[PDB]
Amino acid sequence: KVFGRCELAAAMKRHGLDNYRGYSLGNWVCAAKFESNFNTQATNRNTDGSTDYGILQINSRWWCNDGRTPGSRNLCNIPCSALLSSDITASVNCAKKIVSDGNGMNAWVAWRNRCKGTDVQAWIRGCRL
Numbered sequence: 538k539v540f541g542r543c544e545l546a547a548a549m550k551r552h553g554l555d556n557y558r559g560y561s562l563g564n565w566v567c568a569a570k571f572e573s574n575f576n577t578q579a580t581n582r583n584t585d586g587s588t589d590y591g592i593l594q595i596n597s598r599w600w601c602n603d604g605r606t607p608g609s610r611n612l613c614n615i616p617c618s619a620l621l622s623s624d625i626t627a628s629v630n631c632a633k634k635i636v637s638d639g640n641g642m643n644a645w646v647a648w649r650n651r652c653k654g655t656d657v658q659a660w661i662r663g664c665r666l
């Protein structure tokens with residue numbers, strides 16, 4: 538599913554990401570924009586042989602099982618395919634663990650490079666939230 542911007546903002550808010558670990562909703566929407574273009578089905582292979590999955594590009598080396606990432610962990614205890622669903626519940630629950638892991642939103646490289654320090658409130662402009 539390709540979310541609209543405000544549609545994703547409302548779902549992320551409903552699932553408890555606004556101000557989660559102190560990150561405002563606009564940071565999460567910006568991260569999803571640049572990680573996945575708001576596409577739940579986005580996948581991207583990494584050089585280490587892991588893959589990133591879903592709207593927040595969650596990595597199979599640590600967080601989910603895809604059966605092809607040797608020596609990897611599954612700390613969200615989910616198949617990586619669960620992160621491609623139209624229902625973002627699994628992605629949000631797993632993102633909450635990732636952002637709690639010690640480096641905050643720096644775990645999302647597109648957030649660090651394209652959102653961090655910018656006017657992230659712009660990403661929820663116009664939304665009825």
Ligand code: NA
Binds near residue numbers: 610
């Ligand atoms: Na894994």
